[PDB]
Amino acid sequence: MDDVVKFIHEVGSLKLTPRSGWLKLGIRLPESVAEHNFRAAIIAFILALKSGESVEKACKAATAALFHDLHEARTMDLHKIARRYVSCDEEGAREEQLSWMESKPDFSDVEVYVSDADKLELAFQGVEYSQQVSYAIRFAENVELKTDAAKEIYRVLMERKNPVWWR
Amino acid sequence: MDDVVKFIHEVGSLKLTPRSGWLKLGIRLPESVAEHNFRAAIIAFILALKSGESVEKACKAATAALFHDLHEARTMDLHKIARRYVSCDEEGAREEQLSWMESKPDFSDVEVYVSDADKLELAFQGVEYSQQVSYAIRFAENVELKTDAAKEIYRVLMERKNPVWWR
Amino acid sequence: MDDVVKFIHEVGSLKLTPRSGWLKLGIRLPESVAEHNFRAAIIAFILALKSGESVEKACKAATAALFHDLHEARTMDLHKIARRYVSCDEEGAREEQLSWMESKPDFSDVEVYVSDADKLELAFQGVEYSQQVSYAIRFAENVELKTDAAKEIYRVLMERKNPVWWR
């Protein structure tokens, strides 16, 4: 049970890992990787449901999104610029990180919802941050989504560009 | 002059790049890479002087320490854990980053002072953060220094473990 | 060596001293004095080289820039408004602060590069912060630089007013 406890402590380090791409824009206390995964997971649930999949399938897409950048607990969030000079053995990181699992789950079937959710979460955060730093909107521009549900949500997000959800 | 102005803007991103090893210890607003380089440069100046080198040489070691992690503006501060799964083309990054320079300086002759200053700065910051988080003292333990001047400063640093400089 | 160790601890307090002029603009976690000196040192190096001076000369200008506000570790960054009512014994502060030095190096020959670098660093930081708070741009306006190299860099900084160095 010790491996599981260390793994839960390790997962907590994602609350302490900044989503790095925002730092160069001058955003001082940007969202953490944990916060990106949280919302991306909820978006993935939505994409699956809106795509006609079952609740069970929608819950699997959400879970897969939570495990999506897990290895970054060890490798950090390598932003676009960095990836030009930095190569990471993600498979290795994930391997060792998930050593406590007898077997690892089959998420190949919801990978599309995870991928779209990851990019859509970024677009939403880009529109929200654009209110502080105009240039943040570029992270939401020319996003390549694969599913029709993601494309429709993205279209309305950019149509509105209005993060005020209250009132 | 446009390349120079972009480079100066790029250098400023180091004020927005956290020294990442501290984040997993729960230190929320840790020193930036720029802050690490600032003090390491002053320490490198001191190491050279105390090592019997000339003021001119001491100023070169300080300058070399300022340029030491410059490429991290693009590659990020890859901490110990990350270095296990992450490989970086530092030379590549540095080259592209310093393209504006007609010819880049040597610094091979003060490399030892820069190397020791980097480690000593970390040890001082470890002792300082240990007052917040006990485990930070680990970054100041078992430090492998090369110069006798660095070894003596380190010895007193650890003998005293007292960051209170105001009396 | 105890005086040297305390001095190094003291220098680290500059990572904890805010550049105060920004606080009244509502910028919450502004650059530290350490971060200002870091980039000003790199700029001073650039100014010397572009002014035809030698690398050794450029390295001395950078070092002198690092020691420029050192006394602020004890006196704080007295901003413009404050200086109307606040008088500080800077030489006294520096004197006592550098008592550990057998002798103090003379940076009289590079004081002009240090002076221009200090102001240029502020102008760059003003342009960068203007993306968050419009008024920040005033810190980059009507800047009186002395060297032709600083004037040329400043002219391009203000022609571009574009802190995006990554593309």
Q: Give the CATH number for residue C122.
A: 1.10.3210.10
φ, ψ dihedrals at A88, nearest 5°: -125, 135
CA separation, residue C147 to residues A22, A39, A152, C110, C112 (Å): 35, 52, 56, 11, 8
Supply the range of the domain harboring residue C33: 1-167
Q: Which of C124, C127, C128, C131 to mutate to test the interface with A (most CBs of A within 10 A)?
A: C131
d(CA A41, CA A64): 8
CB pairs A-C closer than 8 Å: 17
Residue A10 · residue A76 · CB < 8 Å: no
Q: How close does chain C come to A133, measured CA to CA in Å?
A: 6
Which residue type sits at B37?
N
- Residue B87's SS3 state is strand
Closest CB to B59: pick one of C31, C35, C63: C63
d(CA B26, CA C70): 29
Cα C19–Cα C20–Cα C24 angle in degrees, nearest 5: 135
Contact: C132, A81; criterion CB under 8 Å: no
d(CA B123, CA B97): 29
Tokens 């760059």, located at residue: C124
Which residue type sits at A146?
K
Tell me whether B12 touches chain C (CB under 8 Å).
yes
Closest CB to B39: pick one of C11, C160, C166: C11
Q: Please, which experimental method was used?
A: X-ray
Contact: A24, B16; criterion CB under 8 Å: yes
Tell me whether A55 touches chain B (CB under 8 Å).
no
HSE, side-chain direction, 13 A CA sphere, residue C149: 19
Residue A145 · residue A151 · CB < 8 Å: yes
Q: Which DSSP state fits C18? A: B
For residue A87, list its beta bridge partners: B87
d(CA A58, CA A147): 14
Contact: A26, C129; criterion CB under 8 Å: yes
HSE, side-chain direction, 13 A CA sphere, residue B71: 19
Rounding to the nearest 10 degrees, give the CA dihedral for residues C145, C149, C155, C156.
-140
Tell me whether A84 touches chain C (CB under 8 Å).
no
Contact: A26, C164; criterion CB under 8 Å: no
> How many structural domains compose chain C?
1
The nearest alpha carbon in chain B to C11 belongs to B39
Q: How close does chain C come to A50, measured CA to CA in Å?
A: 36
d(CA C17, CA B37): 16
φ, ψ dihedrals at A107, nearest 5°: -110, 10
- Put simply, the chain C residues between 133 and 152 with a CB less than 8 A from any chain B CB are 152
| Resolution reading in Å | 1.8
Which chains are adjacent to chain C, needing at least 3 Cβ pairs under 8 Å? A, B
Contact: B12, C153; criterion CB under 8 Å: no
Closest CB to B56: pick one of C10, C56, C152: C56
d(CA B158, CA A109): 55
